[PDB]
């Protein structure tokens, strides 16, 4: 039942969207980050400065240790825990309980950071990313088996206030217009093929392989749109050619001072739209997801102020091109694993002052680009 899952996420892009889960017997309530960039279900198993609560295995009558540990490493951090299995209930969606693999984290580095509200992670990518190996069945694979739901989930983020994780399919109330689908190129991360980037209607004229050079992925656990260094350089170069920054004058004499704005004035009309072209399921065709400045020039301040400060929502990557939460905030995103495709549709919740912050259009021709842009 998909309607019961609407608004089951809390949080924001910056510190994560998270789903509430009840684990073990009696039920311990935890707050789980929704991460399409990893494949383990792992929760705090001991106190940590940046978490409120943790899962205590010794208090669940149903917990079973599987007799091995697990470790995860990524760019600037890592975590280690024990592996077992236990019963989980998802209050918003799945009132029946099911048995899942769980890693209980006892040690970590740059994983639980100050500012977060989650104390665990639900990795929704493929088994091939699971640690210690792909044989540790994924949470969503377990759910599919045990609840007999379709091998499809979709995500809407309304931080551009929470969002929705629909497990088992698509909820029609969460989009308008048509879903466009792009093939999953490799089933590990959710890797898709980017054909072209466009800044204010002007294409970057990089070899399309530059966008996929390592990989282009859809990652709800990354905050920003992250771009390989070369693509980043081209993007910000194009943004500077197309933008119209005010000139220095009375009360505005450094670049830094461009950050904050008073009297309802916003920086948006000074900035260009950004478009990513993805190949359609039909090879000859592509479609294009667009983000307006409303999405990548992001507000910063706590409530109750009469001014706003903003941050640029795009950053360099060393390897992956990451379609992070920045971008996913503009769209309803369907992870159709059953059919090896990712879908995008316009979110109606993705509006500012009743005006759209993102666009999706197609078809466009793919005649002028290589048949495969993934090197």
């Amino acid at each position, epitope marked *: 039942n998909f309607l019961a899952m609407v608004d089951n996420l809390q949080g924001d892009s910056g510190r994560g969207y998270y789903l509430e889960m009840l684990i073990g017997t009696p039920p311990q309530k935890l707050q789980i980050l929704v991460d399409t960039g990893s494949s383990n279900f792992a929760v705090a198993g001991t106190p940590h400065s940046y978490i409120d609560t943790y899962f205590d295995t010794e208090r669940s009558s149903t917990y079973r240790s599987k007799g091995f540990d697990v470790t995860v490493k990524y760019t600037q951090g890592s975590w280690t825990g024990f592996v077992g299995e236990d019963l989980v209930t998802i209050p918003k969606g799945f009132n029946t309980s099911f048995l899942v693999n769980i890693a209980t984290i006892f040690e970590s580095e740059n994983f639980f950071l100050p500012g977060i509200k989650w104390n665990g992670i639900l990795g929704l990518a493929y088994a091939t990313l699971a640690k210690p190996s792909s044989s540790l069945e994924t949470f969503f694979d377990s759910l599919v088996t045990q609840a007999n739901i379709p091998n499809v989930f979709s995500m809407q983020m309304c931080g551009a206030n929470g969002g929705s994780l629909v497990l088992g399919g698509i909820e029609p109330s969460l989009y308008k217009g048509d879903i466009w689908y792009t093939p999953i190129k490799e089933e590990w991360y959710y890797q898709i093929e980017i054909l072209k980037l466009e800044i204010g209607g002007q294409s970057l004229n990089l070899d399309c392989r530059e966008y996929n050079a390592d990989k282009a992925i859809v990652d709800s656990g990354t905050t920003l749109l992250r771009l390989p260094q070369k693509v980043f350089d081209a993007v910000v170069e194009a943004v500077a050619r197309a933008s119209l*920054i005010p000139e220095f004058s009375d009360g505005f004499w*450094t670049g830094s001072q461009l950050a904050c704005w008073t009297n309802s004035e916003t920086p948006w009309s000074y900035f260009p739209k950004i478009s990513i072209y993805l190949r359609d399921e039909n090879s000859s065709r592509s479609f294009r997801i667009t983000i307006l400045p409303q999405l990548y020039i992001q507000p910063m301040m706590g409530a109750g102020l009469n001014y706003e400060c903003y941050r640029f929502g*795009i950053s360099p990557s060393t390897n992956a091109l990451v379609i992070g939460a920045t971008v996913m905030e503009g769209f309803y995103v369907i992870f159709d694993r059953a059919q090896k495709r990712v879908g995008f549709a316009a979110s109606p919740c993705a509006e500012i002052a009743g005006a759209a912050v993102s666009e999706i259009s197609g078809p466009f021709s793919t005649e002028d680009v290589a048949s495969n842009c993934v090197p």
Partner: antibody
Amino acid sequence: QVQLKESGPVLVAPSQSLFISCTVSGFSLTRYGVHWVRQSPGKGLEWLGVIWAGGTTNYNSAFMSRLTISKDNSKSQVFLKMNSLQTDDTAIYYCVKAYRNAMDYWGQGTSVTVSS
Amino acid sequence: NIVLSQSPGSLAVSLGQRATISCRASKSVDTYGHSFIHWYQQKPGQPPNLLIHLASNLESGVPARFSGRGSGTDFTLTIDPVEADDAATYYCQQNNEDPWTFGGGTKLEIKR
């Protein structure tokens, strides 16, 4: 045609005060800021400060204890005054027209020597 | 104070060849994805003169032989192909923060 012309004392004794005028032409001080910049072998180019269209001044904080910039819109002039001169204030002093987020037109510069 | 460090201090390049000169800032000069750093040419006996606005926008009337790149803390000016008239010192200047600062400059020698 935009033009800026500096006029200062070619020579001034230490401790004494420096006063330079900048007479501008081809643009209005009611529409553009004017910056002051100096250049010396020992310190290279230093941005001293600026006076904007509306008369707001912003200064290089290293100089604020002794530097005053001002202008007279009706005389098309901008003024620099600096106190407590030292020999390493010896430099070419430029007035420069504000432009976008940088500077476009410079005067030819006036040579100032601080010594007795 | 953001400090700008140019390298090399001096460079000799043959007519028709490529000159590449670097500017490193001590702190990021970027806001809103724009780099508040600018390139000036100073020919002997003249004041400096703006060539590139905001890291990479070629000023109107400056030849297409000049181009600027970079973001964050690392910027380059490239002159290509180099001409005789290009004998001068080149300066970067930042104003992401106050005071506005200039780098120590790079003298381009034409290697005739």
